[PDB]
UniProtKB/Swiss-Prot annotation:
Induction: By cholesterol.
Transmembrane segments: none
InterPro entries reported for this sequence: Cyt_P450, Cyt_P450_B, Cyt_P450_sf
Pfam families: p450
Catalytic activity: cholest-4-en-3-one + 6 reduced [2Fe-2S]-[ferredoxin] + 3 O2 + 5 H(+) = (25S)-3-oxocholest-4-en-26-oate + 6 oxidized [2Fe-2S]-[ferredoxin] + 4 H2O; (25R)-3-oxocholest-4-en-26-ol + 2 reduced [2Fe-2S]-[ferredoxin] + O2 + 2 H(+) = (25R)-3-oxocholest-4-en-26-al + 2 oxidized [2Fe-2S]-[ferredoxin] + 2 H2O; (25R)-3-oxocholest-4-en-26-al + 2 reduced [2Fe-2S]-[ferredoxin] + O2 + H(+) = (25R)-3-oxocholest-4-en-26-oate + 2 oxidized [2Fe-2S]-[ferredoxin] + H2O; cholest-4-en-3-one + 2 reduced [2Fe-2S]-[ferredoxin] + O2 + 2 H(+) = (25S)-3-oxocholest-4-en-26-ol + 2 oxidized [2Fe-2S]-[ferredoxin] + H2O
Official protein name in the record: Steroid C26-monooxygenase
Alphabetized SUPFAM superfamilies for the sequence: Cytochrome P450 (SSF48264)
């Protein structure tokens, strides 16, 4: 492929500035499965020499379905940490369901599904609709500001608070922890320590479990979460369901600003297809990885036991063989077989319907209260090699 020597698709230096869209396109054309070498000390906490870059939608789906071969446990699924991270600090992440394999995963997912029934999620609708309307009304009243802080941040957090039934008075500290929980190497957040925050959040969760959806999770059925498993569950929600949905909202609104005919159409009909096009466009999770438990032949490439494969959802969601005009933002996109929520399989995002609800509610409220919003200046991108994040974005709400 035509790429610079030493190029690394997980390099946080790239994501601080841009998405490497041209480079992913080059792989899909010239080398759709490509060994991405990493030199010593430059592997984002991994010291195995590199990973297979997976750029095609059908390959990502194949990996995701074959969790019997492609493990989330052996190396976790986050493909990029600070270069100096201790191995122990990666391995401790195996205590969240996301980074477990069957049968352990199977048991926890079965229990935790009690929190994501369409009944549990559907019950949040009216409180989240109310919140979304008030958020959008207060942003409009401010006239201008940081869209991320004023519009994108709060509703995901309130969706988590509401699912868990957190008392109103505790939501401030919960949101504080939650916002320091996902690791990044951004200089704006160099003072944050996800370790301290995670200990404190687990402590708060376990006390909540002691004092008692939380009920359904900790009451025996005799399967239940232990108090510590409930703590780990709450940490996982903070990493899985916060900045993900937030970045879908920011990048969805960036796409509307860049595609005004789509925003006009959205404002009229609020179509059913919008939320998934927003998620495909935004691809909040750029990439998650797996580790081969045995040799496996994938589209003619001989993947070897113990090797990492990185599923670039950001490539796969723009796969020209699957999506007509993939670089066109189309809120009526159909079909839309995107992998923003992952490939179908054991680990497929359990919060996907909650995320869609959150997106629809906030975008309805934005259309209602700020139909003429326009950007003032450029989005500020997060320095992360796996999260596709916007830290700030100044906009004129009127
Ligand atoms: C637009 C927003 C979101 C995006 C893009 C997103 C994306 C993802 C992806 C890519 C995965 C891994 C799938 C796989 O490995 O096959 C995942 C898993 C997960 N997500 Fe989401 N997610 C979002 C919102 C949420 C929300 C709102 C919640 C809950 C509050 C949530 C909870 C989870 C959990 C608990 C898992 C782990 C599932 C497992 O390992 O079995 N996510 N998500
Ligand atoms: C918050 C965290 C780090 C930053 C990041 O990006 C992802 C995670 C999720 C798993 C956490 C971990 C911090 C340490 C935790 C709390 C444990 O001791 C068990 C699970 C693990």
């Amino acid at each position: 492929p035509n790429l610079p020597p030493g190029f690394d698709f997980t390099d946080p230096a790239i994501y601080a500035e841009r998405l490497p869209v041209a480079e992913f396109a080059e792989l899909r054309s010239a080398a759709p499965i490509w060994w991405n070498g990493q030199d010593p000390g430059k592997g984002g906490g991994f010291h195995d020499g590199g990973f297979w870059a997976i750029t095609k939608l059908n390959d990502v789906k194949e990996i995701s379905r074959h969790s019997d071969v492609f493990s989330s446990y052996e190396n976790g699924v986050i493909p990029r940490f600070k270069n100096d991270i201790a191995r122990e600090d990666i391995e401790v992440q195996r205590f969240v369901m996301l980074n477990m394999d069957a049968p352990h995963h199977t048991r926890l997912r079965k229990i935790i599904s009690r929190g994501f029934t369409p009944r549990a999620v559907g019950r949040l609708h009216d409180e989240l609709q109310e919140r979304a309307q008030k958020i959008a009304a207060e942003a409009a009243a401010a006239g201008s500001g940081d869209f991320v802080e004023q519009v994108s941040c709060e509703l995901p957090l309130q969706a988590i608070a509401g699912l868990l039934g957190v008392p109103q008075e505790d939501r401030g500290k919960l949101f504080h922890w939650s916002n320091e929980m996902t690791g990044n190497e951004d200089p704006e957040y160099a003072h944050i320590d996800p370790k301290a925050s995670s200990a404190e959040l687990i402590g708060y969760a376990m006390k909540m479990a002691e004092e008692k959806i939380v009920t359904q999770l900790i009451q025996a059925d005799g399967e239940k979460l232990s108090d510590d498993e409930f703590g780990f569950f709450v940490v996982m929600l903070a990493v899985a369901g916060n900045e993900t949905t937030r970045n879908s909202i920011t990048q969805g609104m960036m796409a509307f600003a860049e595609h005004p005919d789509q925003w006009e159409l959205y404002k009229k009909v609020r179509p059913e297809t919008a939320a998934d096009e927003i998620v495909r466009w935004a691809t909040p999770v750029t990439a998650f990885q797996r580790t081969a438990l045995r040799d496996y032949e994938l589209s003619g490439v001989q993947i070897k036991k113990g090797q990492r494969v990185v599923m670039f959802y950001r490539s796969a969601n723009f796969d020209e063989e699957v999506f007509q005009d993939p670089f066109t933002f189309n809120i009526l996109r159909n079909p839309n077989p995107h992998v923003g929520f992952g490939g179908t399989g054991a680990h497929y995002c359990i919060g996907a319907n909650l995320a869609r609800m959150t997106i629809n509610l906030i975008f309805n409220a934005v259309a209602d209260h700020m139909p003429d919003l326009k950007p003032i200046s450029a989005p500020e991108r997060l320095r992360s090699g796996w999260l596709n994040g916007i830290k700030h974005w100044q906009v004129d709400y009127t």
